[PDB]
Amino acid sequence: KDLKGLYAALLVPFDENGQVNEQGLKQIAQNAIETEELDGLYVNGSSGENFLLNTEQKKQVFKVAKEAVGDKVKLIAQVGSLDLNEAIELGKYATELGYDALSAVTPFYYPFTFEEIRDYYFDIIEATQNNMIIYAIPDLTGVNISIEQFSELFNHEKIVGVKYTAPNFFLLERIRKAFPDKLILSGFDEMLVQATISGVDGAIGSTYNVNGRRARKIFDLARQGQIQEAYQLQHDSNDIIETVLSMGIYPTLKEILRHRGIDAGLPKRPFKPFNEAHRQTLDQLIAKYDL
Amino acid sequence: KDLKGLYAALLVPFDENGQVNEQGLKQIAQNAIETEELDGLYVNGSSGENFLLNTEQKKQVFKVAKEAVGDKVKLIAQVGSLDLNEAIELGKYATELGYDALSAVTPFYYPFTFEEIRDYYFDIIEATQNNMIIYAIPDLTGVNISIEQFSELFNHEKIVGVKYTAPNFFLLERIRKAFPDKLILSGFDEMLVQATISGVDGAIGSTYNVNGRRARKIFDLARQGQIQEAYQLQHDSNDIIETVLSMGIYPTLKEILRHRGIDAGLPKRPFKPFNEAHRQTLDQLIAKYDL
Amino acid sequence: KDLKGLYAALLVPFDENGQVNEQGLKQIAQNAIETEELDGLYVNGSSGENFLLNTEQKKQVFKVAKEAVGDKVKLIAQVGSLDLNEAIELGKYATELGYDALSAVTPFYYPFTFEEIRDYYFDIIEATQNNMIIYAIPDLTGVNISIEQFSELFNHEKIVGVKYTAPNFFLLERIRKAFPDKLILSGFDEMLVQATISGVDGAIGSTYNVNGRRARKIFDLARQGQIQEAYQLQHDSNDIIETVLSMGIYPTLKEILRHRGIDAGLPKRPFKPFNEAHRQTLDQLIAKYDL
Amino acid sequence: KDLKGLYAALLVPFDENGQVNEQGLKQIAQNAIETEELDGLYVNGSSGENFLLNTEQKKQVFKVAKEAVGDKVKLIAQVGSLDLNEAIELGKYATELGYDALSAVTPFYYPFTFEEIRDYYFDIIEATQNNMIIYAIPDLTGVNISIEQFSELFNHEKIVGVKYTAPNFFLLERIRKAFPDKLILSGFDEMLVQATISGVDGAIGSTYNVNGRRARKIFDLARQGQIQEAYQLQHDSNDIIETVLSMGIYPTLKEILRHRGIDAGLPKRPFKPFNEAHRQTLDQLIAKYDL
């Protein structure tokens, strides 16, 4: 498949022991495709609480998400881990399930050299033979990739693109110009309109689980040149994003899904549950925007 | 004169002793208006090497720049200084010359509280009675202004707007929505197109001294919805900006102006002159983009 | 046991598949106690490449290290993980082996609230019933703990102390004064002398695997008031530390151990092996300091 | 006069219009020497609100402070400015008054290259022919100086030392070792004891205006090896520093001086006066430590 389009970063519901609720996960995956009308799922990303999970649980999430959607739906599997053996194990498993591409966060925590980071990507690709999307998230990792470093990664024919999240539209424009044939998917929901006019091929986001229909309008209207209409929809989307961030984003998004009849469970500790102090303000937002 | 529009941040040529060359300053001012077709000048900003000047030289720059241009040209006087007495003296001086508004950088160096910063603006206004534009440049000052802080400043009727430079389009969008009737001029030339679609009322920029005609097209095309054409001109403009940044932006911009026959002098020490190692690369840029 | 003293942060040797070499691990543990004359081991810390390992491998490292040392040797088990279920599983396993205390890195990657971080610690303690040492490493995690936050943690009778690494001797002094009866172990080998005079109870370090005898002299001489002698030994130790950092610290420390006849193996990918370009310079250092 | 020793960073009292109160400035200078028993004054530093003053006021402060004290008192004149012409004028002026050395903050605000910073120092020296002390204060300037950069500066015979404030005792130790014959004066009052054991030749500090007698004991006791006693006085001194920092350090220090009957005036706007909400807490501190 052409991997352009809009993707939900799949949220995962848990029980009080931090185990995956598979029936709720199935519902969330179906919500993103059937109700939010998205093109695909980005599975076991940050938004899925992936870095709090064990290896068997990550496989559970990949299996369930793949079983919950039709064959037209695009699937990207985030397999990055500080344990390269585990990234490779996950990448094979996701590839064999039929995921269209793998993705991996830049190695973090330790002050890896860029050559070490480069060869992490190359090693995953060698072992899996699948296409790879760089997951660049300096806000969480503290790792920043320069254009020269992007050029060295993109020189590999199987590094087909990037999930781009640095709040830097100068660097985004330089990448877009230097690599016209690579895939760039923006990961900053609150700046989708600016990404869109900067030539991104689509976007991956946690908030698209609840606001995917407005997001598709932002994208489509901006590309049409109906720029005032698209920005108004960005203003509305940012009211939502700002609100859910103030309340704790992943649990609050899951509370929005619960309101729709989904068995949305709990976050995985050490994330705490949605605080009920925020309930009235969340209710007003859901009403105001028909969420 | 409502102050929407495109402004050159006026560059200043010095002699070997760091004194102002009034003739070249006049030629730079005229170039911005006549040749680059800009709406106005932002005078004694960062780009004017203002923070390296003495008081008498800052007054000199204000007088020369205003004498150089006709009465239809919009003029904003940057008068911020760590010396509040100096800021007020300069503010009265520029106000008496007939500058259309004042602007002031946030106090920097010392860890001032927000109340101290707020009351610096309020004291400048009380003493000058001119309208005031906040100059927000965290990349240089390390001072960041939150939405709640902007709300407090903008609650003052004579704080009419902001020269906004933080590389944050979420904050920009929140400001635009919260203050639909304040003036927002963006100060990041390399992200003019994203600023424009985010609803800015114009822009102030050092590179507009050499590339103001493309900048006008970006701003006009984007607001008309010809977003792909506007973005292509951003790509071209970003080749120029990236190149001059790599060579030393203020001296390199003055060297491009010297190519047009302007007496562009030298930077003020401790800035060094343009390094002739860059000459070949500069000539290729000038030829490629007809600068 | 009283947990005061000097500890090696245990290094782990791997094969090319990233599996633990148990015979080499045994040798490294014996090196730290018998040759370097240290008081204990800090097991599965950052220096042991812990965050690159799977759960079964972490258990392997705990088992082997415990089997390699006598009953007088103090053992601290680092069990922090982003997976709380795994931290608890490891904490029980290490407790049942007889480790004297558990330790856990502050949760990282996600922007956890402090209440979330607090209850991660409290949850581990509830499940394991062992004493707990906070592992504060802002250089790697980006998480900073304030004195007020330290006070809330130390209010728990089973949080007995901290492995302190923030490069902040004002905060260290405030903690030392506010909590005279808690255990403070410094983790910055290059500032051991300053830690010692700031009243730390001991120190944990990767470089003590090769330089533990000088480190004990720094500590003992500084406490005696032989401050010039202790600082001279810090100058010598910092030549070593600076050198090994420039070459890649964990592999280079392991190459020093290899020189002693230890089966020191390889780092775990994505860490690369020691580069042989550095061999001559490493040889000169080993000679100069008898390592 | 070799310039080792303990210096007050001289505080300046202003009237309501931000003009210097020469009588109170004299009383502050005399207090530092007579009552606090210090070796010298560091004049027109950050603590003197120097960066808020005009040129004529900076000269005024130099003249008043030197007239206030006897010829045995060591005097260092801070003359750094973003205006290099001003720095040279002030340097010549202080040199003619008989100041024992000059000092200068690293140029800040603009992103100057290291060559530009290096040649600012060299140009001040060439024009003044006085000895020069680097004022390194990254907390305020955002400029950090590496060991290799220090090597280049110290290769100049008239750069005799540094006022060192970076919170980095590894760098301090490397500098002390590499340059055994340069003057290193530390500028972090709250870490005087750690500086002293790291081999500094003295210290410059704003809190020594009120607590110089304890500071002398810390410095002397630590160099004698009575490290526990020196550290207890650091604990006491840090109660004072933490308290004044929380209240607004320069106005709060002047308020402590007003308690001794000194005409301590006001801070220069945009600094606000001491907030009387803090009065009770300040009085308790003054009583507890006999300030």
Three-state SS string across chain C, please?
Answer: CCCCEEEEECCCCECCCCCECHHHHHHHHHHHHHHCCCCEEEECCHHHCHHHCCHHHHHHHHHHHHHCCCCCCEEEEECCCCCHHHHHHHHHHHHHHCCCEEEEECCCCCCCCHHHHHHHHHHHHHHHCCCEEEEECHHHHCCCCCHHHHHHHHCCCCEEEEEECCCCHHHHHHHHHHCCCCEEEECCHHHHHHHHHCCCCEEEECCHHHHHHHHHHHHHHHHHCCHHHHHHHHHHHHHHHHHHHHHCHHHHHHHHHHHCCCCCCECCCCCCCCCHHHHHHHHHHHHHHCC
User: Which of these, A88, A97, A115, lies nearest to A60 by C-alpha position?
Assistant: A97
- Residue pairs between chains C and D whose CB atoms are closer than 8 Å: 74
Can chain C be said to touch chain D, i.e. do they have 3 or more Cβ pairs within 8 angstroms?
A: yes
Cα–Cα distance list, A98 to A43, A72, A77, A93 (Å) = 13, 12, 10, 9
C136 beta partners: C164
Question: Strand runs (DSSP E) across D20-166, as ranges?
Answer: 40-43, 74-78, 101-105, 132-136, 159-164
Tally of CB atoms within 10 A around D275: 12
- Helix B169-178 to helix B147-154 angle (10° resolution) is 40
C-alpha neighbours within 13 Å on the C-beta side of residue C27? 16
Distance CA A140, CA A46 (A): 9
List the catalytic residue out of A42, A121, A135, A208: A135
SS3 letters for B27-78? HHHHHHHHHCCCCEEEECCHHHCHHHCCHHHHHHHHHHHHHHCCCCCEEEEE
Q: Which amino acid is at A46?
A: S
Torsion of CA A217, A221, A223, A228, to 10 degrees: -130
Q: Can the peptide bond before residue D270 be classed as cis, meaning omega within 30 degrees of 0?
A: yes
Shortest Cα distance from A60 to chain B (angstroms)?
A: 35
In this structure, what token pair is assigned to residue D107? 């140029």
Name the DSSP letter for residue A190. G
- Helix B227-247 to helix B249-259 angle (10° resolution) is 100
Binding site annotation covers A190? yes
Angle at C138 between CA D46 and CA C110, to 5 degrees: 120
Closest CA in chain D for residue C239: D174
Angle at B234 between CA B232 and CA B238, to 5 degrees: 120
End-to-end alpha-carbon separation of chain B, Å? 30
Question: How many domains does chain D fold into?
Answer: 1
Q: Is B131 helix (H, G, I), strand (E, B) or coil?
A: coil
Burial class (CB in 10 A: 0-12, 13-18, 19+), C275: exposed
Phi, psi of A184, deg, nearest 5: -120, 120
User: Which chain B residues are within 8 Å of D272, Cβ to Cβ?
Assistant: 113, 115-116, 119
- Residue pairs between chains B and D whose CB atoms are closer than 8 Å: 82
A164 beta partners: A136, A186
Q: Is D208 helix (H, G, I), strand (E, B) or coil?
A: helix
Distance CA A178, CA C6 (A): 53
Give residue for tokens 């000059």: D102
Which residues of B lie closer than 8 Å to D, measured between beta carbons? 17-18, 46, 51-55, 82-86, 107-113, 115-117, 119-120, 123, 140-142, 268-272
Give residue for tokens 């949850």: C123
End-to-end alpha-carbon separation of chain D, Å? 30
Give residue for tokens 């022991």: A17
Q: Is A22 helix (H, G, I), strand (E, B) or coil?
A: helix
Residue A234: partners with Cβ closer than 8 Å, 6 or more residues away: A190, A192, A193, A218, B173
- Choose from A16, A19, A78, A109 for mutation: most chain C CBs within 10 A: A109
User: Which of these, C174, C102, C162, lies nearest to C138 by C-alpha position?
Assistant: C162
Closest CB to D231 among C188, C197, C230: C197
Say if the Cβ atoms of D225 and C223 lie within 8 Å: no
Tally of CB atoms within 10 A around C178: 12
Say if the Cβ atoms of B242 and A194 lie within 8 Å: no
Are the C-beta atoms of residues B52 and D82 closer than 8 Å to each other? Answer: yes
Closest CB to B271 among D51, D116, D271: D116
The backbone region for A104, taken as left when phi is positive above 0, alpha when psi lies in -120 to 50, beta otherwise, is beta
User: Which of these, B17, B109, B96, B19, lies nearest to B63 by C-alpha position?
Assistant: B96
Q: Can the peptide bond before residue C270 be classed as cis, meaning omega within 30 degrees of 0?
A: yes
Are the C-beta atoms of residues D230 and D222 closer than 8 Å to each other? Answer: yes
In this structure, what token pair is assigned to residue D259? 């308690």
Cα–Cα distance list, C252 to A165, A277, B171, C11 (Å) = 35, 53, 46, 11
Active site residue B93: no
Q: Is B112 helix (H, G, I), strand (E, B) or coil?
A: coil
Which chains touch B (3+ CB pairs under 8 A)?
A: A, D
Closest CB to D270 among B119, B268, B271: B119
Cα–Cα distance list, D81 to B85, B270, D99 (Å) = 17, 11, 18
Q: Are strands B5-9 and B202-205 parallel, antiparallel or unpaired?
A: parallel
SS3 letters for D138-160? HHHHCCCCCHHHHHHHHCCCCEE
Shortest Cα distance from B163 to chain D (angstroms)?
A: 17
Are the C-beta atoms of residues C183 and C176 closer than 8 Å to each other? Answer: no
Distance CA C223, CA D228 (A): 8
Distance CA D28, CA D263 (A): 9
C121 beta partners: none
Q: Is the dihedral of CA C204, C208, C212, C215 positive or negative?
A: negative
Note the Cα C250 to chain centre separation in Å. Answer: 12
Name the DSSP letter for residue A181. T
Can chain D be said to touch chain B, i.e. do they have 3 or more Cβ pairs within 8 angstroms?
A: yes
Distance CA A167, CA D31 (A): 52
- List of long-range contacts for B54-59, beta carbons under 8 Å, 24+ apart: B54/D55, B54/D83, B54/D85, B54/D86, B55/B86, B55/B89, B55/B90, B55/D54, B57/B19, B57/B20, B58/B90, B59/B90, B59/B93
Shortest Cα distance from C188 to chain D (angstroms)?
A: 9
Give residue for tokens 């053996």: A85
Shortest Cα distance from C70 to chain A (angstroms)?
A: 31
User: Which of these, B167, B289, B192, B191, lies nearest to B240 by C-alpha position?
Assistant: B289
User: Which of these, B58, B67, B59, lies nearest to B23 by C-alpha position?
Assistant: B67
Cα–Cα distance list, A262 to A18, A31, A129, A215, A266 (Å) = 18, 9, 36, 21, 12
Distance CA D106, CA D112 (A): 10
Which CATH number fits the domain that encloses residue C23?
A: 3.20.20.70
Cα–Cα distance list, B284 to A236, B238, B289, C137, D120 (Å) = 46, 15, 9, 49, 32
Distance CA B207, CA B226 (A): 23
Active site residue B163: yes
Are the C-beta atoms of residues B188 and B140 closer than 8 Å to each other? Answer: no
Distance CA B215, CA B5 (A): 11
C133 beta partners: C103, C161
Helix (H) / strand (E) containing D137 = none
Longest dimension (CA), chain C: 51
User: Which of these, D12, D8, D10, D7, lies nearest to D263 by C-alpha position?
Assistant: D12
Phi, psi of A126, deg, nearest 5: -55, -45
Residue A62: partners with Cβ closer than 8 Å, 6 or more residues away: A43, A44, A77, A90, A93, A94, A97, A99
Cα–Cα distance list, C133 to A57, A221, C100, C145, C174 (Å) = 29, 54, 11, 14, 18
Closest CA in chain B for residue D81: B52
B14 beta partners: B20, B266
User: Which chain C residues are within 8 Å of A82, Cβ to Cβ?
Assistant: 51-52
Say if the Cβ atoms of B113 and D272 lie within 8 Å: yes
Distance CA C92, CA D271 (A): 56
C-alpha neighbours within 13 Å on the C-beta side of residue D281? 15
Tally of CB atoms within 10 A around D159: 21
User: Which chain A residues are within 8 Å of B222, Cβ to Cβ?
Assistant: 197, 227
- Helix A227-247 to helix A279-289 angle (10° resolution) is 160
Distance CA D123, CA D132 (A): 11
Q: What is the CA radius of gyration of chain B?
A: 18
Are the C-beta atoms of residues D89 and D34 closer than 8 Å to each other? Answer: no
- Helix D227-247 to helix D208-224 angle (10° resolution) is 160
Say if the Cβ atoms of C51 and A82 lie within 8 Å: yes
Distance CA C135, CA B230 (A): 51
Helix (H) / strand (E) containing B130 = none
Q: Is A53 helix (H, G, I), strand (E, B) or coil?
A: coil
In this structure, what token pair is assigned to residue C55? 């759960």
Closest CB to D197 among C170, C199, C227: C227
The resolution of the experimental structure, rounded to one decimal in Å, is 1.7
Closest CA in chain B for residue D89: B54
Q: Which amino acid is at B252?
A: T
Distance CA B68, CA B60 (A): 12
Cα–Cα distance list, B144 to A225, B104, B139, C128, D126 (Å) = 32, 15, 9, 44, 38
Distance CA B14, CA A127 (A): 61
Tally of CB atoms within 10 A around B290: 6
Angle at A163 between CA A160 and CA A169, to 5 degrees: 110
C-alpha neighbours within 13 Å on the C-beta side of residue C182? 29
Binding site annotation covers B70? no
Distance CA C121, CA C132 (A): 8
Tally of CB atoms within 10 A around D90: 26
Q: Is B265 helix (H, G, I), strand (E, B) or coil?
A: coil
Angle at D237 between CA D233 and CA D243, to 5 degrees: 150
Helix (H) / strand (E) containing B255 = helix B249-259
Please tell me the total number of residues recorded for chain A in this structure.
291
User: Which of these, A2, C105, D58, A3, lies nearest to B54 by C-alpha position?
Assistant: D58
Binding site annotation covers A47? yes
Domain that holds residue C169: 1-291
Say if the Cβ atoms of D109 and B51 lie within 8 Å: yes
Burial class (CB in 10 A: 0-12, 13-18, 19+), D17: exposed
Closest CA in chain B for residue D273: B116
Distance CA B184, CA C13 (A): 59
Q: Is B9 helix (H, G, I), strand (E, B) or coil?
A: strand
Burial class (CB in 10 A: 0-12, 13-18, 19+), B146: exposed
In this structure, what token pair is assigned to residue B285? 């840029």
Are the C-beta atoms of residues A265 and A14 closer than 8 Å to each other? Answer: yes
Which stretches of chain A are DSSP H helices?
22-30, 55-67, 84-97, 114-128, 138-141, 147-154, 169-178, 192-197, 208-224, 227-247, 249-259, 279-289
Tally of CB atoms within 10 A around A259: 14
Q: Is the dihedral of CA D148, D150, D151, D153 positive or negative?
A: positive
Can chain A be said to touch chain C, i.e. do they have 3 or more Cβ pairs within 8 angstroms?
A: yes
Distance CA C85, CA B151 (A): 45
Say if the Cβ atoms of A54 and C140 lie within 8 Å: no
User: Which chain C residues are within 8 Å of D188, Cβ to Cβ?
Assistant: 170
Cα–Cα distance list, B37 to B40, B72, B286 (Å) = 9, 12, 19
Are the C-beta atoms of residues D28 and D279 closer than 8 Å to each other? Answer: no
Angle at C166 between CA A82 and CA D179, to 5 degrees: 115
Binding site annotation covers C22? no
Helix (H) / strand (E) containing B217 = helix B208-224
Residue D246: partners with Cβ closer than 8 Å, 6 or more residues away: D278
Distance CA B67, CA B84 (A): 26
Give residue for tokens 């003020």: B268
Give residue for tokens 């100057």: D112
Distance CA C150, CA D77 (A): 42
Are the C-beta atoms of residues D181 and D161 closer than 8 Å to each other? Answer: no
End-to-end alpha-carbon separation of chain C, Å? 31
Give residue for tokens 């000048």: B41
Q: Can the peptide bond before residue B270 be classed as cis, meaning omega within 30 degrees of 0?
A: yes
Closest CB to C140 among A53, A83, A109: A109
Preceding residues of all breaks in chain A (C to N beyond 2.5 angstroms)? none
Tally of CB atoms within 10 A around D115: 12
Say if the Cβ atoms of C223 and D227 lie within 8 Å: yes
Shortest Cα distance from C243 to chain D (angstroms)?
A: 12
Please tell me the total number of residues recorded for chain B in this structure.
291
User: Which chain C residues are within 8 Å of D224, Cβ to Cβ?
Assistant: 225
Burial class (CB in 10 A: 0-12, 13-18, 19+), C289: middle
